[PDB]
Amino acid sequence: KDYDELLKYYELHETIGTGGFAKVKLACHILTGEMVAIKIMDKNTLGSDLPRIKTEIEALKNLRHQHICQLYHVLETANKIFMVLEYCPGGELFDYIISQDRLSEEETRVVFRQIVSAVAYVHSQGYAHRDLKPENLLFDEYHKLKLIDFGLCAKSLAYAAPELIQGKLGSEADVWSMGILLYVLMCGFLPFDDDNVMALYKKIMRGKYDVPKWLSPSSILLLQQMLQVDPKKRISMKNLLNHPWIMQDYNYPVEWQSKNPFIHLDDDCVTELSVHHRNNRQTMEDLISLWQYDHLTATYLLLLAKKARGKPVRLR
Ligand SMILES: CNC(=O)c1ccc(Nc2ncc(C(F)(F)F)c(NCc3nccnc3N(C)S(C)(=O)=O)n2)cc1
């Protein structure tokens, strides 16, 4: 019914995740053969949370970055909203940490610099993510990280900053959450945890945590600077980018600027679309340039994706 519109363009496979607000299926984009992830939201059962959908959608239309999960297609039917996103076949950072127990400081740094790159970019575009946690970071085919779930972005509790849980500073709050992430990467458990939500809340407010024996002095220092209860004493995003711990083995600050921004339309993509559809090239350019996030946008972007990984730009 609502799936009729979607099934014009995608073959649906297994459900790969269910959350509070959405389920996500693996799918194949018929015209390109590309696997994608389709986020499915029922407008009726969301009700008051329907603003989360528009928030994520508007954010993702304004974010284009090597460590951010790309949006391809938005389809609205009578009862559903479908968001077609980049499929990350490596799954969740969280499950990767559990499988390894914890990461070495070297590997943590490799991973963490990608998280800082994504989040600093998000902030550079005027947003705070506000729901940073390892469930929301996925591995793509290259084993590079992609940030997801922009439903709470502005322009869980275990990861929420004291000031944010107190109802007041979105920038500083993301830094706190990245500190909790950093802790989990290196330790393999949360710095603040409890079965009772108010007791968890108290632990967060107190800011005291276990410091395991395998952590280097420099890592301990970085955690201390990120996990300051007072956001005014917390390390700013700026100084995180070139922090000495962060610079170890790299010697350059985190590269946060988008490496894949939308400058001019790509000729191979446009050409292939015009040839496959047997349409006037200029019309094809004009219709792509509406950037409607309809099936034409989807096809164009999934062709660019083929190019991004050195494959030829070809439609079935
Ligand atoms: C098959 N077993 C796996 O464990 C697994 C899981 C995910 C993926 N890949 C993947 N790629 C892209 C998405 C995208 F774009 F939709 F976010 C996505 N989402 C599922 C999703 N993921 C983690 C947290 N919430 C999730 N959903 C409820 S949510 C907030 O609506 O995205 N999952 C691959 C494998």
Ligand SMILES: [Cl-]
């Ligand atoms: Cl980097």
Ligand code: NA
């Ligand atoms: Na423990």
Ligand code: NA
């Ligand atoms: Na940069």
